[PDB]
Design a protein around this ligand. Sequence first.
Ligand code: ADP
Ligand code: ADP
Ligand code: ADP
Lengths: 58, 309, 66, 65, 204, 191
Amino acid sequence: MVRQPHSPELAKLLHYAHEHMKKQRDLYIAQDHLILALADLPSMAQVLKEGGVTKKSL
Amino acid sequence: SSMQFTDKATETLNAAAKYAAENSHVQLHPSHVAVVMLDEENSLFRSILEKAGGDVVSIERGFKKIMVRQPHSPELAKLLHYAHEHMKKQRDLYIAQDHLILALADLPSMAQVLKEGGVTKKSLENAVTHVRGAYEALSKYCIDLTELAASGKLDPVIGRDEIISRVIRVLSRRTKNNPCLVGEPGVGKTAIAEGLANRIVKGDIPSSLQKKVYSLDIGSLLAGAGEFEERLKAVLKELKEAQAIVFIDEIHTVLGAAIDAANLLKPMLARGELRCIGATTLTEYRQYVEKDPAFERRFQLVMVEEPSV
Amino acid sequence: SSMQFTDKATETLNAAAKYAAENSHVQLHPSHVAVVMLDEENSLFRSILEKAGGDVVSIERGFKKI
Amino acid sequence: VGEPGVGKTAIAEGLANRIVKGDIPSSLQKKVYSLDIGSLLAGAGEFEERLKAVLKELKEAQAIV
Amino acid sequence: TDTISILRGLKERYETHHGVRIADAAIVAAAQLAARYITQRFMPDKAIDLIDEACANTRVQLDSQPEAIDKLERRHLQLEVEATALEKEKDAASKQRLQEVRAEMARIQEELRPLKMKYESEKGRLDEIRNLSQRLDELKAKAEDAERRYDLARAADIRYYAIPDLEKRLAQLQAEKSQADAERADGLLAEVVGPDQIMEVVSR
Amino acid sequence: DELKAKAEDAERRYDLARAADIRYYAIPDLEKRLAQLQAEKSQADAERADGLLAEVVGPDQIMEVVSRWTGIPVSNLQRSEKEKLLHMEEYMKQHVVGQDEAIKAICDAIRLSRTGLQNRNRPLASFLFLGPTGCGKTLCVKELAAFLFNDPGAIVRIDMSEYMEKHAVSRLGQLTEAVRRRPYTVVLFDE
Ligand SMILES: Nc1ncnc2c1ncn2[C@@H]1O[C@H](COP(=O)(O)OP(=O)(O)O)[C@@H](O)[C@H]1O
Ligand SMILES: Nc1ncnc2c1ncn2[C@@H]1O[C@H](COP(=O)(O)OP(=O)(O)O)[C@@H](O)[C@H]1O
Ligand SMILES: Nc1ncnc2c1ncn2[C@@H]1O[C@H](COP(=O)(O)OP(=O)(O)O)[C@@H](O)[C@H]1O
């Protein structure tokens, strides 16, 4: 947030929600839907690795 | 995390490897899954593709030519990984037969044949939308009694040697092959069928009987909606191709009635393609079995006497 | 004048328009209907060619060339 | 007409085992259909609509039930 | 007299499904006892059920084992696991009990194996007899439709190269069945449905 | 208990590699510790000189549950059926006097049905009390259930004031369903 000056990274996040609407099983597309979507980005999964959150355990 | 597959989806990869074993193969390719689904009774892989158009014949012949060029396949490992990653993405509905169509569309090797056949990638999105809104139905809507009996999780049955031996003689007959444990709510009716499943694994049953025991859950079939015909017909279809004996607790509530459900069990019990074990009360037995002459032709009166001291 | 459709023939008519649009076409040729209608589980058109004569593996091959 | 035990369905079974083999000429051969009351009641009322389609096919095909 | 003629018509089909040996003495005795003792229904419903019930009970002894044999087999299974579990232990009390279990299993093997293996070898042969009757009765029915639907290329491969081939196998299994019956002291009632088998159903 | 379930599942599913370490190792090595704690606990309970029947379910423990779900005292549960038929003539004379020839006739019809000198086709004893009013017809019935049945409140009374009509004959049914819930009951036929 300090290094900050749509978004170049937000457009890629919205592209994942377009395909996740037709998959298999989950819950409801709302606040909890974007939780399992930020782990696919390489610039956002680095913080979860150093904090103790495994991608396979998420 | 961990993935959960049904019994029908588990046997799909096993049945695909059986067909590939006769053609001399060492690896299992995902193209063998589409061949097995196109050889079933009232499959869902054909009706969904018909709405989007295309040519299934051009697609079926394209999948059969891929397995011939074959020498766990490296392409199969990507299918199992996609089933675990995409298991927390959409919304409701677990895994079944219609959900496996979207898993094969993500593979680059399978998407080239579909685009060259007719149904493109954009046609698969609108095709699975209109159709939306032990085996597969025998695991969530039914409970296999032989599984809990062989796993040491069943209470022993001592004192029913004069009743279990009589049910075996009824099942071995040509006609009236539908026992009905007629008794009273207190003398024991469900525990009688528990001892019959114990003799199946041990081998005490004759060679004329080799079926299984499935406890038909009445409350599980009424979960939700209208939509009851899609759940009742799925159980009867899985029991016909597998040849098994289903157990129905309190038959007077499901056979003889709100939603009409007894109409789907009459043609099955008449042609000998279904064997049911009844266990109702004598009070309601004279109003749902002896009243209809067609039901007495297939059900035999089995009295359950209360044991002495 | 009025037009009333059923259920089996209705889904086939809507499927012919989607097949002609995904392959970049202009006109709706009648050959784009018998291909989708034949690809059905226990279809009524399959028993017609097998009763009046004619192999079902050679008639469909002539529709893809159109 | 008889008591429920002397045999009723088996009587009609012997009719199909005589016309198909050889008894009456082809000008009077009629198929035998077993109309079940449980098959029409199943499903979705719509019970009278399914019965009308069955009675219509039994006339143009010349067959008993 | 009319009831006897009904049971004789379906004798070939009843012998195929059950797989036992239906004799002519069990047909007359069934219609005679159904008109004096068990009398509450109507013919042939009160006579056919007496045959299917008696033939289904014989299937148990021809495949499984009676209570006098099954009780001995259950005692040997509990002693085999107990003898091995006590062998790993080094307790003084387990060595004395181990000497009694091993001495008891030697007597069981000399009386259960020569008797239980007779039903196991017969099970692999008696089950094949039913498979022959189910296929011979099916080929005679499938070839009959070809003679009435104008098809000579289909009935020629069934009445000539199917029925005569599978018929010789049934005649070979009947000769080996009488040899195994002499070693089991059975055959007069344990595998032949006669007048004594029908009377056991009415008496129960 | 869970190890015995997993051991039997492997032996039935053709897997003799996992059950070989349960029935032969996990169970024989744990039965010595479980049997040692049960032997040391029973010996320590006798040193306290109290609470002997507080850990082992015996005959006195079963009688406590039955006495709570009804109301019958514990002293009436230990009385066997053999001792009741012996001291029956001495108990009826303490409450009903004067009818010395009627008490002996009651015991002669009950003792012949419990030993085995009569076929099992008749009930306990069918009586027919007569004589004038106020001679001991109602009190004798109440004293019968207070000794043989140990329940004075288990005596049903079906009067003929409303069951005399022909339409009430089929309800003898209300009397059939009433005696099914309570086996040991006293059916009294008044008037
Ligand atoms: N041979 C037996 N051994 C142990 N328990 C038995 C036996 N037979 C019956 N039971 C008990 O009787 C009960 C019968 O339950 P169920 O048949 O479901 O309803 P109901 O109690 O109305 O008959 C079971 O819970 C079972 O524990
Ligand atoms: N002439 C016959 N020959 C052989 N079997 C017969 C004959 N007549 C009647 N049966 C048997 O009697 C049975 C009568 O069945 P059905 O009339 O449908 O009901 P129910 O058994 O209640 O009378 C049939 O299954 C048939 O096999
Ligand atoms: N043997 C007896 N000695 C003393 N009192 C008695 C005796 N028998 C009955 N009673 C008295 O009679 C009363 C009950 O009378 P009851 O039997 O109802 O008369 P009835 O037989 O005319 O109906 C009781 O209150 C009881 O005190």
